[PDB]
A paper describes a structure:
DotI is a 23 kDa inner membrane protein essential for intracellular growth of L. pneumophila within mammalian and protozoan cells. DotI has one transmembrane domain in its N-terminal region, followed by a periplasmic domain13. DotI is conserved in all of the identified type IVB secretion systems, including the conjugation systems of R64 and related plasmids. Structural analysis of the periplasmic domains of DotI and its R64 ortholog TraM demonstrated that DotI and TraM are structural homologs of the T4ASS protein VirB8.
The structure of TraMC was determined at 1.5 Å resolution with the working R and the free R factor of 18.0% and 20.7%, respectively. As expected from the considerable amino-acid sequence similarity between DotIC and TraMC (30% identity, 54% similarity), the structure of TraMC is similar to that of DotIC. The remarkable structural difference is the position of α3. The conjugal plasmid R64 has no counter part of DotJ, thus TraM is expected to assemble into a homomultimer. To elucidate the oligomerization of TraM, we expressed and purified TraM using an E. coli expression system, and conducted SEC-MALS measurement. Considering the molecular weight of TraM (26 kDa) and DDM (0.5 kDa), TraM in solution is in a hexameric state with about 90 detergent molecules. The exact oligomeric state of the DotI-DotJ complex remains to be clarified, whereas TraM clearly forms a hexameric homo-oligomer.
Residue numbers in the entry: 90 to 226
The structure:
């Protein structure tokens, strides 16, 4: 298993979960995503949320975050010095803060995600995101 197509699907699934957040349950949604990331990877997600002021806006304005991930592509793959295989993908992502009475403007990005292999004895997916970088599109 662990084909590049499997890894691409893992990344798009992670992005879908990461950026569809509910104004009531967002903290629990976010913590539940941790298994998809290394802790350094998760820092990139936290940075992406902060760069768009997501958490404060969700909390203060009672807005949900919605997002759609487009078709992604493999940039490169290989192994690190440690013999651990990785894949780097980029995906278009559009997201929008949406409230009951109104919304914020949609924002468009390309996310770069590097996924590395993990011992399946530790994480049964055998994968985790070790780096997440948001770029404006």
């Amino acid at each position: 298993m662990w084909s590049q197509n499997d890894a691409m699907a893992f990344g798009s699934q992670a992005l879908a979960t990461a950026f569809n957040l509910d104004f009531v349950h967002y903290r629990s949604q976010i913590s539940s995503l941790s298994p998809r990331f290394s802790d350094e990877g998760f820092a990139g997600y936290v940075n992406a949320l902060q760069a768009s002021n997501i958490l404060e806006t969700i909390k203060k304005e009672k807005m949900n975050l919605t997002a759609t991930t487009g078709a992604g592509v493999l940039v490169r793959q290989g192994q690190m010095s440690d013999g651990v295989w990785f894949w780097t993908f980029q995906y278009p992502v559009r997201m929008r803060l949406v409230g009951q009475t109104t919304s914020k403007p949609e924002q468009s990005f390309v996310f770069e995600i590097t996924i590395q292999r993990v011992d399946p004895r530790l994480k049964p997916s055998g994968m985790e995101i070790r780096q997440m970088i948001s770029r404006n599109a």
